[PDB]
Every structure is written in structure tokens, then in C-alpha cells.
Design a protein around this ligand. Structure first.
Ligand SMILES: CC(=O)SCCNC(=O)CCNC(=O)[C@H](O)C(C)(C)COP(=O)(O)OP(=O)(O)OC[C@H]1O[C@@H](n2cnc3c(N)ncnc32)[C@H](O)[C@@H]1OP(=O)(O)O
Ligand SMILES: O=C([O-])CC(=O)C(=O)O
Ligand SMILES: O=C([O-])CC(=O)C(=O)O
Lengths: 1021, 92
């Protein structure tokens, strides 16, 4: 994408990154004036403004500034101030473009003669770079091909300054030969190393002092920014000079770049009645061409565009901003909206149209008030539901919505919008049935579509031999061959995939726009590959030129870049062309036909498939060469490749605006090489070099001898007409329609449409990983952090699904920290230290320590809680309860400490007990356990409540005493074992600490002493 | 019901090749359990069928059993048996 930059930034980086032996003056000597900025600050930071004379030009990409008198030459500081009084900040015009004149660029004026000026113009072409130089000064440089010196410099080719002195400086004067040759060599090195596309310096003041530039035009390769983030700095792309931006247009513009989907809109006449809400770029272009061709050139309101499967909120915002725009004013003839587009590849039409019907039912009122009419035509995967829901919302809201699918022409609704119709060695065989391919990258959807296309075409072998992905190891990927499971081997490197599969002649590179170049160079070192289809789009033009040069050197055919691929029905499909099998069986692309088409944009290939399936027999082979202006395979190569192929009977060519690409087809038809019938139509008229427009190309092809339709409406008509005229000559025989094999439906696709039920197991209620953000119980994670709940809060949300109060969460944290560790001599910590000391990881050591936690170790929590709960719930006094436990022959668990008895409290029982006394609202069970320990300390002084008993009774007390628990759930979590989770989660802290401690002390493997075993084995068995 | 008629495809994960629980009888590698018992292969035979998916010869299966029986125990003072005794002694 060559974008024109402001000349201020261009000469800033010119003075920054020039590399020549000569001295280049005016170093950082320029100034910018806008109506926002003042003059005192610009005077004080730049003290050089009072040294020499000054010159001012408009810095808003205005061509031929000196011819229209918009430049202020030979004026001083107050002179240019008074010159910018009636000019800065208001309306001005150049050519046809009228708009606000905002920016002015100011340079030190150099007094120059007419002989010291020079002309230089360097730009990029397909076969190399053109260098144009003229030595005679001024604007009058004459012809650029004979008197001015022209240079073809190749790609990956060094420019010798000896060639510059030999050829570029023939008629140049001898006094300024070496300095200008060094400047030309430095300019070429700068142009190559910073990746421009176009440079033009018409005034080049080369005096005895040095070289000055005064005016320049610069177009940069904007797709190479990943190479030059550090060398462009803060690069600026100014818009073309014209009218201002509407707030709705700016809203569309800054919602466009916030996703990976193209959301574009540009208005022509804001008071028009014919509107555009259209998917697919080529569809919008041919709609604009047909509206401007049918007489609505002064009535076409806008061209809009939504591509790349935009989100529901994206299409909602776009639809509300574009449907709130014809509701400002009304028309005596009504107003018409067109929900148009081509056939979608894989986008669900029904969901996008659900967003559309929600955005329309939001604003049905003003639409009924302004008397609008909606004409809808789309297609693709599940457009039946979309047309049905448009029909439903038309019958509900009362707006007359007329809906069609792929059975009609894609543009013919425009044909009833104005009422013009009644309303109802390069090889010539690229792919064959033996053709295998290697896909570069994880594109399992594309490979599955590849295998589905191979299965429906009754082909014996799959066309995917291997997959190459450098970021994973060598394994196998599980795919479908009809009903069967098959395995496609995925390789890390390319060399083993090339050795194991010598039958591969096709590589499809799904790499990114910045990793495609090196992968393509690595591919072309293997001689088995005859064609590479490069899908990525964004690749800089110089690397693409290097790819083209090596492709011409090696004979490999490169389909792309910037393409969707190419389809040969019956033999092979590249990538994502056609779509899924809904469009393939809709367009009958499972058998070969007799028509072959070449197109540029991949979005129009689906409609070309539809037109060739409906009007004529079908597609034999269709290749989309890509939207890049440097294609690896041009139109002319594919047209001769079809002409050499005897299988085709006619060729359909769909070019676009720009490029002299099919003038080769014109002169080849005039040369008699091209004998097969050709139907050609140029999209992109846009008449709202003179040979680059589509209309002049159209009658150029018409008097070339091509059946060119008048518009896109008659394209299918003229294809059908030449088909019926050509079957009368007895060269096309329609074959018998063999029914194709039928694949089964995808499960995810048939659950998206909701025509299946699968019993969903694995019921859960503690986490919602899907959606926007994490939801624990019913509240998001940001509400968890905003309410400042602790770790006890997320145990409340995850274990009990309830927002516990602050004292309950703080008590849960409190009973976690006392449970954290109780030394290494306990049994679980002993297991942790043993497993960690035997060289295991953290998970195994912590795990082997946690598995000790059972009934004897750590079982006093849950069993003590259940014991005191069954004592308190059965209505037994503590004096009878102690006697009942004594005479049943089992101890009261949770009661009894070894050493710390009376006026020597456990000191963590005390803290928990105190926190329960001031902070809990009501404590029946704790007071019951206090009475039980008051009895048992009267028995023996060390029979106090343990921490294992007090955490249990206070946890049951917390569940059945605080809010939000309904008195079966407070008794249910005790039975399930929520007390055990508290102990295990607390003691995991100490166990991980034990693991880290035994690994940090670096202790070798433990073996128990033999004197601590006392073997009692039998004598002989 | 819609997979009985074969009008849907679901990507089946969990690829395995060591047991066939469905059908009539148990199939370990490619041979049924009655052929496992009729050929009189030992426990080394079912390690050959389950781990390597191959019918190992009789000396290989007997050697696998032989290297299992010497590996059976080496006392309680080793670290894993110490962990077993500790976890078993804690009521698990
Ligand atoms: C109208 C029509 O439909 S016609 C279509 C015309 N144009 C097109 O076809 C263009 C559409 N497709 C593309 O351009 C895409 O680039 C495709 C299809 C080639 C796929 O490209 P992407 O998915 O963007 O790139 P990819 O998945 O390889 O990842 C991008 C980068 O992420 C890197 N990456 C991935 N994961 C990680 C990670 N975890 N950490 C760091 N880096 C990572 C990748 O390595 C890659 O790096 P690279 O740029 O150096 O290769
Ligand atoms: O197949 C493609 O690459 C185009 C696509 O998915 C879409 O946005 O509809
Ligand atoms: O929790 C248990 O029952 C064992 C324990 O930590 C202790 O020695 O106090």
C-alpha cells in the first residue's frame, strides 16, 4: 500500500538518512504554521528565521503549487505573515479538489539561477526501479525518455556510480558531474534502504556551495513498517486534500481500526436516497459502478463496507450510525437502503442479520416516518434463516423489506431500485487429480475444507500431504476423509516434510505478512515445488519483487500474494476460496466445466462462481491473483496458461481500476495468439494516466475484439449469450450430472444453528470461564476486588457460592493461618520432606504429604465438628454428654492437649476464641464446647479444646449462626467435608514451605536406619 | 439418533490403541482375551500387548515377569516404602 506522506516528514528523513560524500545544507531548517500555533514560540525555538530570505508553500499534498500561485517566494518574515493573513485557515481550491487550507511549510529561500536546478524522479515498477534525471533547470525538462536520462535498475541489484556517470550524465555539464553522481547514488541508497515507492524532486538547487531541495513529493510503502519502526520515527500519513470529515464518518473511522475487520464508509451526496450497507469490497465497487451507470450518479449517497466478519456490537454501531443518517432529511421519491454483498465464505449470515434486525428494530420509528425501503441480497452459510428473519422483521415493523438469495443476480436489485425492471519453465498444468500440497501453518479449518473439497469431487487421494509449523514438534493431526478419521503428519522443519513426501509440487504458505518472504525463499530451494500460493497480505513490495525475480529465475509459479487462493473444480482447491461445502454444492464446483476465470479480488470470485454456475456449464479452473499491485502471477500468464490448456472453451477476465495489465491481453488478441472466446469486464469506474480508468479500458477491450458487457448486470447475460452461441458450433457438450458424495454436517456448525441436542454432563456452579470476565458465584472478579474481600471471600464464593460477611471471611483467613503448619514431625510434613528430599517436584512432594491427611492425621476437625453438632442437636447437656462418651468407650475428639493445660493456654486457641467472642453474633455451639471443656479440665487439666476442635465448632457455629444459610445447607457442608478442605488448604502452605526448605538446604536422599525397624519375619515359608 | 443415521461428524479426540472394551470380548492389541489365555502367555505377555502392542516371544515375556519379581520389594527403609508405611499407618 503506497501512501503519500507529507513533504515535511519526507525531507526530514531525507536530511536525516542521506549517505553521500557531498555536503547537504539546510540541516533541520524548516517550520510549520497552523492556525492553532502561535508565532512567538516558533520564533524563539528557531533563531534562524531572521538570517536569510524565506519561502512558504502549502503542506497539504497539493500538486502544481507554483502554477496556481499558492506559493510565497522571495518574501521576508512580516512579508510571509501578511501573505498568510488572507490564506491561513479557510477555503481554497486546486484542480477539482476544494477544501480547507490548514498547514503551511516554510523554508529558507535560496536565491537560485535557472541553470543550477535539476530534476530527479525515482520510483518503483514491476521489473525494477525507474530512475529519471534531467539536467536542464526549471519546470521545462522536456521529454522524460529521450533527452532526460532513464534508468532501469533491477531488484537485488547494486547501482554502480560508474553507470551513473556513463549513462545518467551524458548531456550533464562536466563541472557538476561527481557531486551529482554521488547525490544520485546516495538518494538511491536512501530510497532502497528506507523502502519508499515514489520520489520526485523538481527543484534541486545544486550550486557551488552544495545541494538544496525546495519541493518534493514522496509516496512510501506503508506495509513495510515492521522493518522501519525505528527509522521512520513518528511517521505521518496526511489525507488527500478535500472536504472535512463528518462526525458519523469519523465515528466509523475510529471504530474501524479497533478490530480485525474492515468497517469503511465514505459519503458522496449526504442528501441522496440510494444507500449502501454492503459486505465485500468488490461488491460495493460494482454496486457503486452500477448505480453511477443506471443514472444514480448524482443520487448515490455513500459507499460503505463491512468485511472480515465484524462483531454484533460493531455491526450494531455501524448500522445505527448509517441508519441515523438518512433520517435527518426526507426525499419526495422515498429512500432506499441496500443490504447487499457477495457470497460469504465461512461467516454465519444469520448472526450478522440478527445484529441487523436488532439495529433496525431499535430505529423502526424514523424509518417508518421517512418511508424507506430495504432491498436485501446476500448468500453463504445459512442464509435461509437470515432471509427468514428479515421477512419476519419486515412483516412485524411494517417496513417493506424485499429479500433474495443466490438464485438471482447479485446486482439486479439495483436494477429494480430505480424501477428499471419489474419487481418479482512455467508449466501450463498447475493442478490435477494427482496434485498434492503442503500447508504452511496451523490452518486446520482450511485443511479440513481442502479435504472436504477432495472428498466431494470423488478424488481417490487427499491433496494435503503434510503440514509445516516451526513452533511445534513432529506429530499427527486428526482430520476427516468423508466419514473416516485420517492422520496428516505435521512437521517442524520443511526438510523432513520434503524428504518424506517427494510427490509434493504445491506449497500453500499461510504465514503472516512478515514471515512469508523467508518461508517462500526456503520453499524455492526445493526443486519439487512447481507452485506456491502465498495467502498473506501486507508483504512489502520490494520483497514481493524479489519473490517475482526468483520465481522467474526458477520457473515456480506464485499465486498471490493478497489472494484467497485458486479453485480447480474436480482437481484441487487452494485455501479458503469458495468457502465451505454450502457454497461448493451451491455453485456445483464438484465437477469440471468449460469456463475459466481470472480475477484480482478474492471476494468477487464467489460471485464469479455463482454466475458461471447459473448462466453456463461451470468452472474448469479459477485463480484469484490477489489484491497486491505486484502479483506473482499476472493476468497474462494465466490467460496463456488457459489458452495452452485444451480443456477450457472460454476465459472470463475480471480486472479492476489501474494497471496496464490486460493491454497485454489486448495486444495478444491482436497478435492472433489468443483464439478462444474471452468475456471481460472492468470494475471500478469511479468517474465522479487517462488509460487507467475502467471505462476507457472497457471500449479499448470492446474494439479489441472482446465480448465486453455494458455493465455488471449484463455480464452473466453476455456469458450466457456467448455460451448459447458457442454450443451451436458443437464444441461444448454438457456432461451428465453425476451426483456428488455427501459429507455429514459438522457438529459445531449444526449446534450453531440449533438443530441438535446433546446431553451435557459435568454440571458446575463455581466458575464461569467464558464470556467477558471471570464470575465466581454470580459476581465478576472486578466486583470481587472492588469490594475488598479477602481470601475468605473467594472461599465463600467458590466453596459455598455465597457472599459471606466480613467477619466470616476474616475468620476463614484466621482459621487458615493457624492451620498453616505444626512442625515437621507430624506425619504429613514428614511425607512432604521425604518426597521432596528424594528429588521430586513441588506437586509430587505436596501431594504425597497431603495424602497422609485422613482420619488419624487432621481428622479431628471434621469429626470433632460432627461430634459436637450431634451432641448439640440431640439436646444432651454436657454433663450427660461426657458420661455418654466415656461409657461408649471412645474419646471426645478435638479435646485434649499434651502439655499446655491450665493458665497456660494454647495461644492460638485463645486468638480464635477471642475473635469468635467479639465478632460472631451468636455462639451456642462454642459455649456448649466451653462447658464440655470445663467438665473435662475438672477431670484432667490438659483436656482443653484443641485448635482442631475449636476451628470445627466455630466453623459449624459460623455456618448455622450467620446469614445466607438455610439450616439444611449449614448442616450439609459439614457432612460433605468442608472442614477437611479448611485443614488441607491451610496445611498446603506449610507443606510447600517444607518442600522449598528441603530443596534450599540441598539434602540428599533419605534412608531409614536399620536399628529403627525391628524385623519380625517368619522363620521359613 | 442423528449419529445413528450418519448425517453428522463430531471430531473424536482421545485416540487409543491398547484396549477394545466394546464388541463381544476384550481385545488388547489385535487379539482377544480368549486367545491370550489359550496361548498361555504370562503377565509379561499382557505387558507386551498393553505397553508395546506386540506379541513378544516367550523368553521376553518370562524375562519381563522375572524383572518384575526382583523389583518387587527392597525393604521398608527405602524412601517410597517409608512413604507407604507412613500413609498406611495414618489410617488411609
Ligand atoms: C476479501 C477476502 O476475503 S480476500 C483475503 C485477502 N487477504 C488475505 O487473504 C489476508 C488474510 N490472511 C492473512 O493475511 C493472515 O496473515 C494469515 C491468513 C496468513 C495468517 O496470519 P496470522 O494469523 O496473522 O499470523 P500467525 O498466526 O502466523 O501469527 C502472527 C505472529 O504471531 C506470532 N506468535 C504466535 N504466537 C505467539 C506467541 N505465543 N508468542 C509470541 N509470538 C507469537 C507468530 O509466530 C507470528 O509471528 P510472525 O509474524 O513473525 O510470523
Ligand atoms: O475465508 C476468509 O478468509 C474470509 C472470511 O472468513 C470472512 O470474513 O467471511
Ligand atoms: O491436625 C492433626 O490432627 C495433627 C496435628 O497437626 C497436630 O499434631 O496437632
Amino acid at each position: 500500500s503506497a501512501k503519500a506522506i507529507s513533504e515535511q516528514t519526507g525531507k526530514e528523513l531525507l536530511y536525516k538518512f542521506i549517505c553521500t560524500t557531498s555536503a547537504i545544507q539546510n540541516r533541520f531548517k524548516y517550520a510549520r504554521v497552523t492556525p492553532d500555533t502561535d508565532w512567538a514560540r516558533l520564533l524563539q525555538d528557531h533563531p534562524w528565521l531572521l538570517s536569510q530570505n524565506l519561502v512558504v508553500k502549502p503542506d497539504q499534498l497539493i500538486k502544481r503549487r507554483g502554477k496556481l500561485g499558492l506559493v510565497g517566494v522571495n518574501l521576508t518574515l512580516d512579508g510571509v505573515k501578511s501573505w498568510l493573513k488572507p490564506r491561513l485557515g479557510q477555503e481554497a481550491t486546486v484542480g477539482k479538489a476544494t477544501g480547507f487550507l490548514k498547514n503551511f511549510l516554510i523554508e529558507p529561500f535560496v536565491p537560485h539561477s535557472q541553470a543550477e536546478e535539476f530534476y530527479v524522479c525515482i520510483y518503483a515498477t514491476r521489473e525494477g526501479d525507474y530512475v529519471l534525471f534531467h539536467h536542464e533547470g526549471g519546470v521545462d525538462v522536456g521529454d522524460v525518455d529521450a533527452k532526460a536520462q532513464k534508468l532501469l535498475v533491477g531488484v537485488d541489484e547494486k547501482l554502480n556510480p560508474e553507470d551513473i556517470k556513463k549513462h545518467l550524465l551524458v548531456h550533464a555539464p562536466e563541472d557538476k558531474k561527481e557531486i551529482l553522481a554521488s547525490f544520485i547514488s546516495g538518494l538511491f541508497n536512501f530510497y532502497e534502504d528506507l523502502y519508499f515507492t515514489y520520489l520526485e524532486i523538481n527543484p534541486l538547487v545544486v550550486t557551488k556551495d552544495g545541494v538544496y531541495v525546495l519541493d518534493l513529493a514522496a509516496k512510501v510503502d506503508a506495509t513495510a513498517d515492521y522493518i522501519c519502526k525505528v527509522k521512520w520515527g513518528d511517521i505521518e500519513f496526511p489525507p488527500p486534500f478535500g472536504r472535512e470529515a463528518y462526525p458519523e464518518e469519523a465515528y466509523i473511522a475510529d471504530l474501524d481500526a479497533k478490530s480485525g475487520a474492515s468497517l469503511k464508509l465514505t459519503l458522496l451526496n449526504p442528501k441522496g436516497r440510494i444507500w449502501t450497507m454492503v459486505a465485500g469490497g468488490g461488491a460495493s465497487v460494482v454496486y457503486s459502478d452500477t448505480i453511477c451507470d443506471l443514472g444514480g450518479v448524482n443520487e448515490l449517497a455513500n459507499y460503505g463496507e463491512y468485511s472480515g466478519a465484524p462483531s454484533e456490537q460493531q455491526t450494531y454501531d455501524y448500522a445505527k450510525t448509517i441508519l441515523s443518517l438518512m433520517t435527518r432529511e426526507k426525499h419526495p421519491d422515498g429512500k432506499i437502503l441496500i443490504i447487499g454483498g457477495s457470497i460469504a465464505n465461512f461467516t454465519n449470515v444469520a448472526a450478522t442479520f440478527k445484529g441487523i434486525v436488532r439495529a433496525i428494530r431499535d430505529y423502526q420509528g424514523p424509518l417508518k416516518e421517512h418511508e424507506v425501503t430495504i432491498f436485501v441480497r446476500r448468500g453463504g452459510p445459512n442464509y435461509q434463516e437470515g432471509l427468514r428473519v428479515m421477512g419476519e422483521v419486515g412483516k412485524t415493523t411494517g417496513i417493506p423489506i424485499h429479500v433474495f438469495g443466490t438464485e438471482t443476480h447479485m446486482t439486479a436489485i439495483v436494477g429494480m431500485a430505480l424501477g428499471h425492471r419489474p419487481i418479482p519453465g512455467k508449466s501450463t498444468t498447475l493442478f490435477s487429480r494427482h496434485t498434492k500440497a503442503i500447508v504452511w501453518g496451523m490452518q486446520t479449518r482450511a485443511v479440513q475444507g481442502m479435504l472436504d473439497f477432495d472428498y466431494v469431487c470423488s478424488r481417490d487421494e487427499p491433496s494435503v500431504a503434510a503440514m509445516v509449523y516451526p513452533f511445534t514438534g513432529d506429530h499427527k493431526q486428526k482430520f476427516y476423509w468423508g466419514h473416516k478419521e485420517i492422520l496428516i503428519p505435521v512437521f517442524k522443519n520443511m526438510a523432513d516434510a520434503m524428504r518424506k513426501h517427494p510427490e509434493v509440487d504445491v506449497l500453500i504458505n499461510f504465514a503472516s505478512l512478515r514471515s512469508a518472504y523467508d518461508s517462500t525463499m526456503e520453499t524455492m530451494n526445493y526443486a519439487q515445488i512447481r507452485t506456491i500460493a502465498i495467502i498473506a497480505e501486507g508483504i512489502p513490495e520490494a520483497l514481493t519483487r524479489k519473490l517475482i525475480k526468483k520465481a522467474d529465475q526458477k520457473g515456480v509459479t506464485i499465486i498471490g500474494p493478497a489472494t484467497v487462493g485458486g479453485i480447480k473444480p474436480g482437481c484441487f482447491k487452494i485455501g479458503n476460496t469458495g468457502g465451505m461445502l454450502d457454497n461448493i454444492l451451491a455453485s456445483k464446483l464438484y465437477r469440471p466445466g468449460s469456463v475459466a476465470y481470472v480475477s484480482r479480488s478474492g471476494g468477487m470470485s464467489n460471485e464469479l462462481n455463482n454466475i458461471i454456475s447459473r448462466t453456463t456449464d461451470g468452472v474448469y479452473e479459477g485463480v484469484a491473483i490477489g489484491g497486491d499491485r505486484y502479483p506473482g502471477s499476472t493476468f497474462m500468464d494465466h490467460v496463456l496458461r488457459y489458452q495452452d490448456t485444451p480443456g477450457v472453451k472460454m476465459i472470463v477476465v475480471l480486472g479492476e481500476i489501474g494497471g496496464t495489465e490486460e493491454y497485454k491481453i489486448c495486444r495478444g488478441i491482436k497478435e492472433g495468439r489468443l483464439t478462444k472466446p474471452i468475456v471481460c469486464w472492468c470494475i471500478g469506474t469511479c468517474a465522479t494516466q487517462a488509460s487507467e480508468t475502467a471505462v476507457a479500458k472497457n471500449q479499448a477491450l470492446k474494439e479489441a475484439g472482446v465480448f465486453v458487457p455494458r455493465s455488471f448486470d449484463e455480464l452473466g447475460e453476455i456469458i450466457q449469450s456467448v455460451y448459447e452461441d458457442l454450443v451451436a458450433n458443437g464444441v461444448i457438450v454438457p456432461a451428465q450430472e453425476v451426483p456428488p458424495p455427501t459429507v455429514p454436517m459438522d457438529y459445531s456448525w449444526a449446534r450453531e444453528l440449533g438443530l441438535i441436542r446433546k446431553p451435557a454432563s459435568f454440571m458446575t456452579s463455581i466458575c464461569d470461564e467464558r464470556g467477558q470476565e471471570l464470575i465466581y458465584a454470580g459476581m465478576p472478579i472486578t466486583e470481587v476486588f472492588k469490594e475488598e474481600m479477602g481470601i475468605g471471600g473467594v472461599l465463600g464464593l467458590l466453596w459455598f457460592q455465597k457472599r459471606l460477611p466480613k467477619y466470616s471471611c476474616q475468620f476463614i483467613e484466621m482459621c487458615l493461618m493457624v492451620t498453616a503448619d505444626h512442625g515437621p514431625a507430624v506425619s504429613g510434613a514428614h511425607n512432604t520432606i521425604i518426597c521432596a528430599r528424594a528429588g521430586k517436584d513441588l506437586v509430587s512432594s505436596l501431594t504425597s504429604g497431603l495424602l497422609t491427611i485422613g482420619d488419624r492425621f487432621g481428622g479431628a476437625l471434621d469429626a470433632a465438628a460432627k461430634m459436637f453438632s450431634k451432641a448439640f442437636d440431640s439436646g444432651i447437656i454436657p454433663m450427660e454428654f461426657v458420661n455418654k462418651m466415656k461409657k461408649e468407650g471412645k474419646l471426645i475428639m478435638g479435646i485434649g492437649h499434651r502439655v499446655k493445660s491450665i493458665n497456660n493456654p494454647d495461644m492460638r486457641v485463645q486468638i480464635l476464641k477471642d475473635y469468635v467472642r467479639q465478632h460472631f453474633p451468636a455462639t451456642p455451639l462454642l459455649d456448649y464446647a466451653l462447658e464440655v471443656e470445663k467438665i473435662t479440665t475438672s477431670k484432667k487439666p490438659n483436656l482443653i479444646l484443641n485448635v482442631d476442635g475449636l476451628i470445627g465448632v466455630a466453623f459449624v457455629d459460623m455456618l448455622r449462626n450467620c446469614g445466607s444459610f438455610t439450616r439444611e445447607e449449614a448442616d450439609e457442608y459439614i457432612d460433605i467435608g468442608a472442614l477437611n478442605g479448611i485443614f488441607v488448604l491451610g496445611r498446603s502452605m506449610g507443606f510447600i514451605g517444607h518442600y522449598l526448605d528441603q530443596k534450599r538446604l540441598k539434602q540428599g536422599l533419605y534412608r531409614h536406619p536399620w536399628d529403627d525397624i525391628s524385623y519380625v519375619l517368619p522363620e521359613h515359608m
